[PDB]
């Protein structure tokens, strides 16, 4: 994982279970994926019970951030130190 991190970065999480993104803001996760938590582009876009981030490997490959990021069910992941 990386220690040079995305703009406004808050903390990381790690997927405990796998998740398939159903809709047009949502992020895809595999059980074991680190996700770099970031703050939202608007407060109305923050869904209740959701988190926004980008996958750490998606960011360690240095891909298009604004297309690689998404919202995920925080309850699929764990807060890592």
């Amino acid at each position: 994982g990386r220690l040079d991190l995305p703009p406004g970065f808050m903390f990381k999480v790690q997927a405990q279970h796998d998740y398939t993104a159903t809709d047009t803001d949502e992020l895809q996760l595999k059980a074991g994926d680190v996700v770099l938590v970031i703050p939202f582009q608007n407060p109305e876009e923050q869904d209740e019970g959701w988190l926004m981030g980008v996958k750490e490997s998606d960011w360690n490959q240095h891909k298009e951030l604004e297309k690689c990021r998404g919202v995920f069910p925080e309850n699929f992941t764990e807060r890592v130190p």
């Binding site: 608007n42 109305e44 919202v71």
Partner: peptide
């Protein structure tokens, strides 16, 4: 067995005439 469930997403940017 024992899998989590994603929570309900909410309305935003709503506007009508």
């Amino acid at each position: 067995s024992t899998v989590p469930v994603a929570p309900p997403r909410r309305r935003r940017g709503r506007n009508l005439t």
